[PDB]
């Protein structure tokens with residue numbers, strides 16, 4: 402008779418929102434369980450419908466999976482809420498966050514691998530889903546399932562125990578997995594270590610409540626998950642100091658960083674809230690280099706439409722075009738998404754400056770080379 406996991410109100414609200422023609426139309430997708438052969442419903446909204454005070458959503462979870470019961474639907478799997486970059490929304494501006502949020506501020510690196518949700522049902526089933534798919538898509542759900550079973554065998558923990566512990570806490574584990582079949586990202590990642598990383602744990606409720614990272618680590622050691630680096634800053638001023646110093650330095654712990662995911666609790670009602678701080682440079686310059694490289698490999702055309710980093714991009718083309726012309730093997734891997742970072746650093750070595758050092762004296766050097 403336990404109605405503590407009944408979510409039929411939210412199910413009714415989602416079904417009603419499904420019929421809405423154009424604004425806030427609930428998107429429904431029925432998947433089949435890979436273990437129990439039963440069915441689970443995945444709900445999802447349009448991205449442009451998120452994060453707007455004029456568009457109230459029944460739930461704000463990126464990834465939501467509910468059971469297929471007409472008298473007691475239960476949230477099988479829940480992901481994080483949709484959270485946005487700084488200044489992207491009026492409630493992620495650099496001034497509103499200090500006023501309306503408190504500590505403790507937790508900073509993790511931006512994920513690079515595929516995201517998977519691991520939960521458990523009453524029947525001991527270990528339900529592994531991915532971006533709105535459990536049938537199964539990217540099929541990273543099944544890849545991560547194989548990784549998880551392999552790592553559970555390595556510690557002798559049966560998947561039944563993990564499913565039962567998830568069910569008893571009514572939690573979904575959000576995990577990032579990075580296979581070697583994955584492509585390279587523009588900025589290098591020092592936590593490649595192919596396997597399953599545990600990004601967090603959420604309670605399967607309509608509202609967003611996530612475990613603190615220490616509990617996540619304790620759960621991960623209990624189930625052979627690869628731990629994730631993070632740092633804690635108690636106040637907003639310390640966090641702004643760390644973020645601005647890291648941006649002025651471009652190195653977190655001797656590594657190139659694309660972005661940070663920062664978790665905190667809102668000052669009013671003490672609810673969890675995430676926001677992203679993305680370092681625009683040197684990500685933009687490197688991605689422009691990669692795009693012009695792919696354009697040359699596919700067309701042998703070195704004309705580009707960019708307005709920023711034009712001189713350094715032309716120098717990069719001067720250095721790299723002979724390499725691409727005379728190394729057909731490098732072109733194939735580059736098009737497949739490999740060797741981007743190595744070729745980038747080869748150019749950075751030829752030019753004699755670091756990427757940040759290039760960015761610092763760039764208008765100086767561009768105007769100087771134009772003047773000559």
Ligand SMILES: Nc1ncnc2c1ncn2[C@@H]1O[C@H](COP(=O)(O)O)[C@@H](O)[C@H]1O
Pocket residue numbers: 463481482483484510511512513516662677
């Ligand atoms: N560590 C992370 N950094 C950035 N986005 C994340 C992370 N973990 C999960 N996401 C979610 O992934 C989605 C965007 O991924 P993508 O657009 O494929 O880069 C959004 O729903 C994010 O909230």
Ligand SMILES: [Cl-]
Pocket residue numbers: 407408409410411607
């Ligand atoms: Cl509800």
